[PDB]
From Swiss-Prot, chains A, B:
HAMAP family tied to this protein: OMPdecase_type1_A
Gene3D superfamilies membership: Aldolase class I
Organism: Methanothermobacter thermautotrophicus (strain ATCC 29096 / DSM 1053 / JCM 10044 / NBRC 100330 / Delta H) (Methanobacterium thermoautotrophicum)
SMART domains in UniProt: OMPdecase
NCBIfam families assigned to the protein according to its UniProt record, in alphabetical order: PRK13813.1 (NF010386), pyrF (TIGR01740)
Catalytic reaction(s) noted: orotidine 5'-phosphate + H(+) = UMP + CO2
PROSITE patterns reported for this sequence: OMPDECASE
GO cellular component: cytosol
Highest rank taxon of the organism: Archaea
Protein name (Swiss-Prot/TrEMBL): Orotidine 5'-phosphate decarboxylase
Entry keyword Metal-binding: no
Function: Catalyzes the decarboxylation of orotidine 5'-monophosphate (OMP) to uridine 5'-monophosphate (UMP).
Length: 215, 215
């Protein structure tokens, strides 16, 4: 990922989303698009980005349904041009395998979300997260998401999935996570608001990378 | 809910979705719309349904993000005209409260999904589900979703949330659940494929209600 930095583009206005992404394109090669933007502007926004900016697109859809519905969601998402989709592991192995099957059919990738970054993740997810990660290894998942806000957890995740798996991490900036500390364990950081709500998104992104390189 | 029967409209084609929903409208007053249809045809499909059919719309979006993103998802969903949204409880209380706050602002309702109906739900969700339901009671949630495929679980859910809460239940038909058994505990059943993949959806729906009335 260019500069180890993935933009979380959660503005809900196409014009704002396009402005900010264009302003920071020199600093990233991947954009994470989620439901705030897609449910406001349509799934066609994925192909517009991917084309306009040349970027890869991770669809952060947190897929969390039964297997049959998960396959439909994944196939709609890959048809729209996403390169990868983020899947919850808490629904269990059949639900994840459904996503993996569609990704295999369509030449795309699944990222498994194993522990979330917000405080409420401590209630139920955290106690299951090591076992969710192990499930992912046993299913052949190679791409994972874990929390910048808890680097000790992020370290344990890395220790379960090994060095060859790819690990991305949200919660940097607005949620309190630190770029350099997170990159001790994650391959790339996800950053949303610290960039897209900045008075100068490009300067915000540049400053983060100046940190990353200094690693 | 008319006839205690909610249609899960997971066809991915607007013309097919409209045909089937129109054919069974005499039997239901609520349609559950999810990501298979919305991510194929756009969020505008909600207002088209709600208007064309006069029905209420439950958005089965399984909202499962951090609090800030959950508020955005909910506000986009209610702006599109949904009457209610289904929220996962596994992300914890802050994530649920975010949804409740937007629902309060916009005069809408939240349904809390506490145990899922598919086999993989046994791995992580089931062991947390009673505590997820209790969390919902403590947050003031009045509307719940639990599994037709496990009526003993559905009974335990009902025992936690009490008789005055509203409980709907998927997994009837294709996943193996039974209408009459489920309605011992749930107020309404959700049915998708057994209706929408039938050679005669209206006859399928009529037959289910003939069962329900016979209760
Ligand atoms: O555990 C997770 C999973 C995904 N996200 C997503 O990553 C982004 C974080 O953005 P921000 O906090 O940098 O604005 C948002 O899209 C959010 O939905 C998290 O924050 N935490
Ligand atoms: O635990 C849950 C939560 C929601 N759904 C949804 O309810 C519907 C079940 O449809 P069917 O199995 O009757 O086709 C689908 O939309 C599915 O995504 C479940 O099946 N189980």
């Amino acid at each position: 990922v260019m500069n180890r930095l993935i933009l979380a583009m959660d503005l809900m206005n196409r014009d704002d989303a396009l402005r900010v992404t264009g302003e920071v394109r020199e600093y990233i090669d991947t954009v994470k698009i989620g439901y705030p933007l897609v449910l406001s502007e349509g799934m066609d926004i994925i192909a517009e980005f991917r084309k306009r900016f040349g970027c890869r697109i991770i669809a952060d859809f947190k897929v969390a349904d039964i297997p049959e519905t998960n396959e439909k969601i994944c196939r709609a998402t890959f048809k729209a041009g996403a390169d990868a989709i983020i899947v919850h592991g808490f629904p269990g192995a059949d639900s994840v395998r459904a996503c993996l099957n569609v990704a295999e059919e369509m030449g795309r990738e699944v990222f498994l979300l194993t522990e979330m970054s917000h405080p409420g993740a401590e209630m139920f997810i955290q106690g299951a997260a090591d076992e969710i990660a192990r499930m992912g290894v046993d299913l052949g998942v190679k791409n994972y998401v874990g929390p910048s806000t808890r680097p000790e957890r992020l370290s344990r995740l890395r220790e379960i999935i090994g060095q060859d798996s790819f690990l991305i991490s949200p919660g940097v900036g607005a949620q309190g996570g630190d770029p350099g500390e997170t990159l001790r364990f994650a391959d790339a950081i996800i950053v949303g608001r610290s960039i897209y709500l900045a008075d100068n998104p490009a300067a915000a992104a540049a400053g983060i990378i100046e940190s990353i390189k200094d690693l």
